[PDB]
Every structure is written in C-alpha cells, then in structure tokens.
Amino acid sequence: SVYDAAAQLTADVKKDLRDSWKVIGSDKKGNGVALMTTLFADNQETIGYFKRLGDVSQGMANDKLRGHSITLMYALQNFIDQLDNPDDLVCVVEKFAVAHITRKISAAEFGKINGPIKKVLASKNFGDKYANAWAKLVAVVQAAL
Amino acid sequence: SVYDAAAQLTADVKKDLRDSWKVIGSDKKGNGVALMTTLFADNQETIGYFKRLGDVSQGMANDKLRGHSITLMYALQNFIDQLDNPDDLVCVVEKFAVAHITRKISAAEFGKINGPIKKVLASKNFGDKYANAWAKLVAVVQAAL
Ligand code: HEM
Numbered sequence: 001s002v003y004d005a006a007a008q009l010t011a012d013v014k015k016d017l018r019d020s021w022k023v024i025g026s027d028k029k030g031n032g033v034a035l036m037t038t039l040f041a042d043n044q045e046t047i048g049y050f051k052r053l054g055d056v057s058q059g060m061a062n063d064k065l066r067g068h069s070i071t072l073m074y075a076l077q078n079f080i081d082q083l084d085n086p087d088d089l090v091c092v093v094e095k096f097a098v099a100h101i102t103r104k105i106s107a108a109e110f111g112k113i114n115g116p117i118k119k120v121l122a123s124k125n126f127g128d129k130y131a132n133a134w135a136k137l138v139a140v141v142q143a144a145l
Numbered sequence: 146s147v148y149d150a151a152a153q154l155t156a157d158v159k160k161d162l163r164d165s166w167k168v169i170g171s172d173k174k175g176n177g178v179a180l181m182t183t184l185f186a187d188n189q190e191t192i193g194y195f196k197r198l199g200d201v202s203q204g205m206a207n208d209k210l211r212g213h214s215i216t217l218m219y220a221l222q223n224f225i226d227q228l229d230n231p232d233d234l235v236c237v238v239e240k241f242a243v244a245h246i247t248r249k250i251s252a253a254e255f256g257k258i259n260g261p262i263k264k265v266l267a268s269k270n271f272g273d274k275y276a277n278a279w280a281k282l283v284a285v286v287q288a289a290l
C-alpha cells in the first residue's frame with residue numbers, strides 16, 4: 001500500500017520537494033514551530049493529542065513545544081533524504097508510522113497537517129505547485145496509518 | 146540534572162563531535178545498521194526491547210531494522226545541530242527521552258550504546274578522544290532518563 005503511494009512521487013514531485021525543503025529545512029526551529037502553531041490555530045481539536053506539551057499558547061517560548069517542533073522537522077529531513085530509494089523511503093515511513101498508529105492517529109487526522117504545510121510554504125513564496133507535491137509525500141505516510 | 150550535564154559539552158568536545166559526525170553521518174544507513182548490529186552482538190540481552198523488529202540477525206536485509214537504524218541516525222543529527230544552543234539541545238533531549246522513558250529504558254541500559262559507538266568510530270579511524278566526546282553527549286540523554 002505504501003509502495004503504491006510512493007509511486008506517485010514522480011521525478012518532478014521529488015524535485016519540487018527537494019527545492020522547497022532547501023529553504024524550509026534551513027530553519028527547522030522557526031518553521032517547525034510555525035507548522036505546529038498553525039495546526040493548532042486552524043484545527044484546535046488536534047490539541048487533544050498534545051496534553052503533555054502543556055501551555056501550547058506560549059508557542060516558541062514553550063520548551064516542550066519547541067523540542068517537539070524541532071524534532072518533527074528531522075522526520076521530514078529523513079523522508080526527503082530517502083526520496084531516491086523507494087525501498088528505504090518505505091521502511092522509514094513505516095517505522096515513523098508505528099508510534100503514530102499507537103496514538104490512534106488516523107490517516108484523516110494526519111492529513112490535517114496539509115493546511116499548515118501549505119501556509120508555511122506560502123510564507124516562503126512557494127505556491128500551490130509545491131503544496132501539491134508535499135500533499136503527495138504526506139499521502140505516503142497516510143497510506144501507512 | 147540534564148542542565149548540568151549539557152554544561153559538560155565544552156568547546157573542544159563540541160568540536161570533536163562535529164568533526165567525527167562529518168564522517169559518521171555521511172552514511173546514515175550503513176553506520177546506523179552497524180551501530181545496531183554491534184549493540185545486539187555485544188549485549189544480546191537488549192534484543193528483548195526490539196521484539197517488533199523481528200530477526201535482527203538479518204541486518205540490512207531486515208526492512209524494520211533498516212528503518213529503525215536510519216531513523217536513529219537522524220536523532221543524532223538533531224543533537225549535533227543543537228550544540229550551538231544549550232536551551233535547544235536540552236529541550237530536544239528531553240523530547241527524545243519521553244518515548245524511551247515509556248519503554249522503561251534506564252540510564253544504565255541506554256549507556257550500553259557507548260560500546261557500539263566507540264567501535265564504529267574506530268572503524269573510521271577515530272580513537273578514544275572521540276569516543277569520550279560521544280560518551281559525554283550520551284551522558285546528557287542519560288541525565289534525562
Ligand atoms: C508532517 C507531519 C508530522 C511529522 C513529520 C511528525 C513527526 C513526529 C515525530 C518525529 C515525533 C517524535 C517521535 C514519535 O514519538 O513518533 C512525533 C510525535 C508526536 N506526533 Fe507526530 N508528526 C506529524 C504530524 C502529527 C499529527 C498531525 C499529529 C496529530 C494530530 C501528531 C501527533 C503526535 C504526537 C501526539 C506526538 C507526541 C508528542 C509528545 O508528547 O512529545 N503528529 N511526531
């Protein structure tokens with residue numbers, strides 16, 4: 001199932017992912033927090049999954065939220081780095097899904113991250129072309145949930 | 146405390162960590178798997194914690210083990226990238242510790258990774274000086290467990 005989803009990562013899609021990551025991934029703390037605070041603002045219900053982080057309204061100043069946000073970006077760094085070898089991409093995505101499946105996060109839930117990604121990309125001047133590419137990468141993860 | 150342990154990362158320790166990571170982190174898949182297989186070989190009693198991975202003796206051919214090994218290297222990448230800011234290193238270490246605490250991995254059981262690190266380091270012509278530097282970084286995680 002994950003292999004079939006990975007098949008949608010065409011040469012052009014991988015190129016747009018790598019080009020946009022070159023910018024987004026250069027400030028993992030800043031963009032990681034931006035992603036999370038945007039998720040919480042647009043889909044407040046997702047906060048139910050992050051009780052451990054405490055007062056998420058503090059944003060960057062919240063050490064636990066910052067710690068999670070920075071760490072989240074390294075999962076994406078991992079994915080981007082494995083783009084050229086489907087076998088490696090698949091095994092890392094399945095590994096990544098394990099902990100999220102245990103948390104009972106469905107593919108539909110996970111997909112809520114698409115909006116925030118689109119907004120973060122747009123803040124760096126990366127249009128819909130790039131947003132759609134990222135939606136395809138997220139789809140590979142969804143296929144594993 | 147983790148705050149006191151993070152203070153032990155002196156200027157030269159951080160430098161030695163970076164210089165060795167430049168080489169070690171160049172092959173996350175190869176060195177990651179080497180790190181895991183070495184751990185399982187020298188401390189077979191730790192295999193019980195990795196039941197989900199299946200037959201670990203298969204090494205690189207085991208998709209689940211390869212996925213875990215590659216992923217483990219991105220946690221180390223994260224730590225190295227945070228060396229400049231003590232505040233960020235600490236929050237990323239505490240975040241990292243959460244999942245390991247819920248697996249009941251003690252500071253003593255985590256420290257068993259020091260052996261494998263020393264051996265992988267030596268296979269790349271990095272001696273005691275570097276092994277001790279990495280032991281100091283591992284000590285930061287141990288303080289959080
Ligand atoms: C681009 C998307 C995402 C990435 C790259 C990502 C990455 C990560 C990583 C690397 C971790 C730490 C390892 C682990 O425990 O699994 C994590 C933890 C977690 N993730 Fe995901 N995640 C994403 C989206 C989501 C979404 C949409 C939810 C739920 C609405 C979610 C909920 C969680 C929770 C609750 C934790 C534990 C937080 C804590 O208590 O420290 N994740 N995620």
Ligand code: HEM
Nearest residue numbers: 099191194195197213216217220221244245250254255258
């Ligand atoms: C250099 C030290 C280590 C690093 C960087 C590391 C990194 C990681 C990462 C990134 C994960 C995935 C996220 C998570 O669920 O926490 C993980 C999972 C795990 N770690 Fe650690 N770890 C290290 C040492 C250890 C040691 C020494 C043990 C046990 C003696 C351990 C046991 C586990 C287990 C059982 C899992 C889950 C494996 C699975 O079912 O996929 N880790 N670790």
